[PDB]
Symmetry: D4
Subunit: 205 residues, 8 copies
Amino acid sequence: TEIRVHQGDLPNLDNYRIDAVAVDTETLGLQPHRDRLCVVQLSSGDGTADVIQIAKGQKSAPNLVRLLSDRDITKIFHFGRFDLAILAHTFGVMPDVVFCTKIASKLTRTYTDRHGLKEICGELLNVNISKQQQSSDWAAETLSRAQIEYAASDVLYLHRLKDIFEERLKREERESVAKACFQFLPMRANLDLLGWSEIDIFAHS
Amino acid sequence: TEIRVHQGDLPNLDNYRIDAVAVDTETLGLQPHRDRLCVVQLSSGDGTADVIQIAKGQKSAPNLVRLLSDRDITKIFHFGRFDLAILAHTFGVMPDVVFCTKIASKLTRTYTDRHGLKEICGELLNVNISKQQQSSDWAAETLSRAQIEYAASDVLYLHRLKDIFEERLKREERESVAKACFQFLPMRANLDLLGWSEIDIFAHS
Amino acid sequence: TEIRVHQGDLPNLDNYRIDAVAVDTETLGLQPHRDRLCVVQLSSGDGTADVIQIAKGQKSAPNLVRLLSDRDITKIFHFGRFDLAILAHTFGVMPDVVFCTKIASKLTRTYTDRHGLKEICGELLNVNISKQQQSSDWAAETLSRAQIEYAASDVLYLHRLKDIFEERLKREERESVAKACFQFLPMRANLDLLGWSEIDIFAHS
Amino acid sequence: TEIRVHQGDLPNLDNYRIDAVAVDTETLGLQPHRDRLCVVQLSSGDGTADVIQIAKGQKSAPNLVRLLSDRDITKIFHFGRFDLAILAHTFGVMPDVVFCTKIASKLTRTYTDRHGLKEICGELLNVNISKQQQSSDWAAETLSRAQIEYAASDVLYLHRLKDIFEERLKREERESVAKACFQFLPMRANLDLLGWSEIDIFAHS
Amino acid sequence: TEIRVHQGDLPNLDNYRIDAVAVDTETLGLQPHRDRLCVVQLSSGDGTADVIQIAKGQKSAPNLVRLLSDRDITKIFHFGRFDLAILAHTFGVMPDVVFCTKIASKLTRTYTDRHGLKEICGELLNVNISSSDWAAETLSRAQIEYAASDVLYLHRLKDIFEERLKREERESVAKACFQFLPMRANLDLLGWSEIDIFAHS
Amino acid sequence: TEIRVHQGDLPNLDNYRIDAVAVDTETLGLQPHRDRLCVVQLSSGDGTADVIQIAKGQKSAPNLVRLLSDRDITKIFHFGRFDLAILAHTFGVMPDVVFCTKIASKLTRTYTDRHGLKEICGELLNVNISKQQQSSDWAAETLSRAQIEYAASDVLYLHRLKDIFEERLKREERESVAKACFQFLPMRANLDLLGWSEIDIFAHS
Amino acid sequence: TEIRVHQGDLPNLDNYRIDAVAVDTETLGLQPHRDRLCVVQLSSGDGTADVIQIAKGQKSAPNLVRLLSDRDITKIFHFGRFDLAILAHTFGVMPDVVFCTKIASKLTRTYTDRHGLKEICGELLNVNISSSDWAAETLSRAQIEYAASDVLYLHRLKDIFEERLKREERESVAKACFQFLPMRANLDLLGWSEIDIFAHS
Amino acid sequence: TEIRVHQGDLPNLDNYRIDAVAVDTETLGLQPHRDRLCVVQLSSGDGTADVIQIAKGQKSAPNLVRLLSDRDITKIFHFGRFDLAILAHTFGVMPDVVFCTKIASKLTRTYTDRHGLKEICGELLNVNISKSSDWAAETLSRAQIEYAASDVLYLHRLKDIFEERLKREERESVAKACFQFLPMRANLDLLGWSEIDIFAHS
């Protein structure tokens, strides 16, 4: 495949005049207040991807942020609860038009309890993802070729998943539930950033 | 302490030309598919309450349902996740303008882990609720005086709580978070009715 | 509260020409292979009770056992799963016409999770039990007056509960469920005696 | 080796004039109120099987239902607690003459804690029911060849297992225990449909 | 309610020419390697008790160890698994003729799951037995009375438990358990205090 | 019981020319990044206390911070792990000469598992602390008299506890262990601020 | 690899004039009141084994029971707590001179938490040992070879464990544990199988 | 892989005039009061290692203990919490200048929850460790000696990488304070608080 590697930001949005963009991030860990954003991966849904290295202390990425702020472009995530949190904490913009394949899976793949990306890709596309050591030093000044190819592999197939999940949501008549969940998802991410990350806010206890 | 007891529905809405109504329900249990709605309690925020007995198999309550559907009137609940579910299952109308004191408590009373109505009322109003008859035969043809007075006691003070919680949400700058949670709450209740009551839909696992 | 205390067997069945008898036992513990049956309590529902002391190693009690075996008389228990097991283990006769107030409670009092006899008597009858002498040497040669009054107190109210539970089962349209559960209960007790006392035989795991 | 695929119902009962029929279902999940029945599999015990796709919203299957209702034909399931529940919820008929290989296993394979169908078939017949997954789109308009072969493999061996388990139940003198458990199993399924699916109705707590 | 308080050791064994002695200890905690022995309580069963305060670092307490070592005198404990361990760690002698009311209760009071001394005394005798700085140089009167209260009733319990063990025909089981109890305490001292040595896992 | 209430800071340090100062804080909750400091309580040990209300967003308290950073004054806390964290987060200065009565209790009161302030005060001093207002609106513009007396009661006794614990630590020869723990405690608090609040950094797992 | 299969009992004790015998059983499960004894395996410590199939309802095995109750012959088990229980339930005789390799492992192999027979044989001997319907009228060859494989190595383990117990100076602890083990099995038969009788709770 | 096996003590410290030494131990188990120290392994960071067999009941090893006591030499451990405890219990000297690769991992490898030595070596070095046994045997096997040496051969390289990572993420003073406290954590273990997080609320 084609993986374009950039420093700081996209040079322009010439490749992203599209209706939906696949988005994924890579960080130093699960705690946005401690673990900085290190890499952002994007795809137009074609056979190529862009991998943008974010520098320590970087506060702005205008072209990327333009994509994240544009309400006419749906941002596709897998477990967007996390990516939205870390992106908003880093760049100050919370996306508000999103689609999450994990929520969609929990709303459609009711016949399994395994909702990870590897399992979804295996069932829906017969594509074998080798998630061998996503645990690596993403803060390295120069990423290895294996790192870049693994990082890119996480976004090349989210569009196809979105198409299938939209078919499943239509088939089982769950469109309005999914729409409301996606509408609330950015506020779930905000609640995480504000300090309620360990609390199911709707639970009795 | 005026408590008006009705069969089936309010006779009219003459007492409910108001901006916010306190609402609470009493059922045979926690499972809306098994445990029917038995009592609905309402208050205008004054010193009186209305207690409406719902008959087995009753499908319609036009004055009550009119109130529940009126988007210009905020419905106040404590743990509305449950009440919304059982009301929508029974009358076919899901309220969409709501305020929940338990979510508000979880967003404001961050210094305690006890968010039940008794504890909230004790701290905020110095009012002692004697929560004893939560387990009684709510399907009895004639409710006892003790049942009616206890049941009414659960709605007389939700307005005062709403006022205080709005003050607290303004003070800690969490108004937009609360507004988004309350906007999503009816769909959380719908998810409960559809079969995800044991699933935190936003959790990783 | 006439309480008749007997050694060994009933003198006759003159007081038990009735359609239903309340039955309850006392042993040295929950494991029938280790903990012997010490006392059998009976009531006809007339406000009096018979308390029959069973001697160590006693294998037969023909009048009592004939009563327990008579299929025209429903035996009322609280948690008959245990009593049926210990009675069959001791006397060699497995009752097959039973009513269990704990199963009935689990099928009707769906608004609570407390199904003990004290709580049931409190809710349904306003009666107050005093379960204190449950930890006593029931194998003592001479039972104390306090032991006798407690033992009788455990059977004096089961008829009134059965009447109320039958009303509730009719009201909630669960009569055939209860009938099938009670029909299966003696085999559940047999399964306990055979060695499956810790296994829910119908569970997936 | 031969799997006949039908839409809606059996064409006739010419192939099922037998003493016992193996039955197995495939659904969208474990919750009968949410997850619809998609594929029913039958087997006369011969080398062929019938696989019937059930359409969304289908309420009747007259030829199939005639076989499910027939008291003269024992229905063999593996974990019939679930299949009985989903069949009754879908077609309104509860079979009442059943044999469950999992209950029989729990009553006979006392030397192991693994009672799944794969392990039973491996131990008792040296037959490998090794599958791909129980997680595919069973609601697909066209089932794949792999899906059809997997669906058929789950019923091809239940007759041989029934024969072996009947021999073992006779050997260890547990025939009446198993018979009573099978007699109660349909009501266990009805209890599941009414809302007690998470409750061991016979447990002390 | 006679309680004799001593420093270090009994003055003599004039009060202990008896068939059975009730014994109880008080320490700084549950871990014999960390928490030193502070008090030893004794009773002849006559309704009086001796309370012997043991100093920090004390390695010997003569005549006391003779009483604990004498195979013709049964030592009665409640949960002796612990007391035997702390005594052996302090004085180097493991008693080997013992009776433990906790084992006896577990072998006879099969109708309850509460085996504490307070509950046993409440059920069997209708007697109400209802920590602190046991290393204080001078014990308070309340401390002395509590320490004595822990030994004043063990003889009556042994009598009742012996009746129950004979009645339910478990005397040889109990006897074998008591015979093994000193080695169980030794195992605790050696490092297996958190391990059920006979369990499969 | 003189209690001096101030806004923002001590007026001067005239009352705090002492060798040890008792320090205790009151916050909106357990999470320093979310729950702000509201009330700081000091006590020279002379039977009087100072209760200082800290305003929302206040970044500076020069007289207080001067006392917090004075290495010639040991700061006494109960569970200083938390107070040190919230003080450093709020005012930017981490005290480095501290004594914690909870660590001292865990190192000395080896005969109990209850190390809360109520149990320590009860055992060591026969003083009854009524901890009933640990959950109130500490951010209120005007504190109630009951709040002020409760807040002061938490610091009035720490000097006497420090004296006793020092005697006990000397008696059992654990002074150097405790001393090293107190030296590490401020870094434990820093670890809490950086995001390792839920991790025992020294545990194997 | 000689395996002699018998019905009911040994024909004689000609092969068992020895100081120690390896013993293992095979049942229908872990609960002696429910799951009957199906097979008893014996070894003299040589390269052969005897596998005795016991019929349902069999009450007597006089030659076998004579061997089991001979106090001059040590019975070696792996997890004898269970086998002793099932043997006593079936034939009414509790062996009282035993060695258990699981207790010995727990007393000597303190560097691991894996005490199964496969792991012990792997570590101590570099031997690879690597259920089924034991009530079948005719056992398969695989069944017979597995049943024999469970007893062929217990003598060598006893030798090694005795070396380790001497080396770490725990011989008397192990001896006391083995002396108590038959009563622990009896306690299991009487109804305390899920209770650690020496535990505080 | 030169591995020198010794009985009782180092013959001298001629090979250990260095600024950091990797140290690891092997015992009969985790409880120092029950399970005696059996082997001590050392490395100078070169391609050789020394494996020193400790006899049962041995209370002193003067050259080795002099090395462990020397404040000018940082002792590198993996999970030094245990090794420090057993060494101090055995020889009476508590090291006070230490580096622990497990604490360093917990402070830097925040993207994983697997902090074992095998995983660390795999991630940081692409080195495959093939990881007990009766270390009290009178004669150790060759396989034992190779396994024992493999645990110290790589700690220097890990320390160098972790020092780079600690500098990069600006956590040097946190790590320094944790390593400074680690010997007292080990002492707390010896006195009886081995199962207690002394800083936890409960």
